Every structure is written in structure tokens, then in C-alpha cells.
């Protein structure tokens, strides 16, 4: 009922759960079982990691539940995913969209974004931001695309069951005219339009652990 991912790059399923797992070096590993329990342990010494458990596809009505038992300081923990419309012009930055719903962070990755609006979801106050990536990596290769962010007004604590109500963030982005392209396809060259609870660790100074469970 589990995989221990230690390779530099891997995607796939463990039972009902999808995962993506990316490393530019080092011994960082992701363990995931079929009940959505996950464990990321990272090296400490300056490589980068992005990975976590989730669904290959973005469901506009998904209610994501998770709890973190351990989180020693990963650059950020965020719901993380993609939308992609193969019929749209590739010079239109909305043809492909990377989106983040941040739960915790050492530094704020949304700081380059332009503010959209503030709203409440599951009793949590969020603010939204939109930035652009110019000729950067993506599920469809190097391209120029928008990033949509939702950032909570406080860090989400460990040891508690949290909820991310994806419909609320889709709506908040749409409220400012930020539309998500199709989130249920494989049309892109490199990856499906997945949606995962990502553990992101950039240039870590100390060894680290993030563990918990995700479900919907």
C-alpha cells in the first residue's frame, strides 16, 4: 500500500492518490501510502525539492482535508496544481496556469503577485495574488504563464485537521477575472493537470521533516 520515492523525478499513483516528486539532487525522499499518509524527509545542504500527494486532476468541487503532525520548516506547504487549455494561444498567459493555496511558509512566495481580493473559506481569511512566470518550467515545457495564489492571513497550525475548499479559491480568483483553464486533462507534454499538497524545500540549511495525511 506504499511507495518510497528517492529518484530525482517521479509521478504516479499509490492507490487512489496521485503524487509528484521532484529533486535536483540529494537524498530527499517522499513516502506515500494508499490511505494518503505521507512523509517527506530532506537533506539539508542546498538542493531543491517539490513534491507531495494529491489527485492527478483538479476537481472544482473537491474539499481537501489534511493534517500535519510534523513540519520542521519547509519553504512552504501549499495546495499546488495546474490548468491547461490546449486550444488557447501559447502567447496568452492564461492558456496555462499554475496555482497555489499556501498553508505554511518560511518566506512568502506570493510577494511578486498583484493583489486581487480578500475572502473567507472554512472560517479562514485568505488574500489572493497573481504573478507571471516568463519562459519558465511548466507541465507543458518552457513557457510564459500566470500564477494564482491564495495566502491565509495566518500560518495553519500543526496537529489540527484543516480543510481547503477548492471551490472557494476558484471563485475568489474568478471574482477578479482570473480564470482557470481546464484542470482535467493530460494534454500537456510533461504532466497531467494535477493537484497535490506540495512540500516545497528550497536551499535548506538544516535537515527536515514534513509528515501527515491528506484526503478528500
Residue numbers in the entry: 1 to 216
Task: Please quote the authors directly.
A number of predicted genes that showed similarity to carbohydrate active enzymes (CAZymes) were selected for expression leading to the discovery of the first exo-1,4-β-xylanase from glycoside hydrolase family 11 (GH11). This enzyme was able to degrade xylooligomers, which are known inhibitors to commercially available cellulase cocktails, as well as xylan, yielding xylobiose as the only reaction product. The protein compost21_GH11 was predicted as a GH11 family member and shared 77% identity with a non-characterized GH from Marinimicrobium agarilyticum.
The final model was constructed from the first to last residue of the crystallized protein, which was cloned without the first 13 residues that were predicted as a disordered region and reported as a signal peptide. The structure of compost21_GH11 shows a typical GH11 fold of a β-jelly-roll. The curvature of the β-sheets B1 to B9 forms a cleft where the catalytic residues (nucleophile Glu98 in β-sheet B6 and proton donor Glu200 in β-sheet B4) are located. They are created by additional residues, which stretch between β-sheets B5 and B6 and in β-sheet B4, respectively. EL2 blocks substrate interaction at subsite − 3, which accommodates the non-reducing end of xylan. This loop is stabilized by a number of hydrogen bonds within the loop main/side chain residues and van der Walls interactions, especially between Pro192 and Phe186 side chains. Hydrogen bonds are also established with EL1 and with the turn that connects β-sheets B7 and B8. Here, we show that loop EL2 blocks one side of compost21_GH11 active site, transforming this enzyme into an exo-1,4-β-xylanase that acts from the non-reducing end.
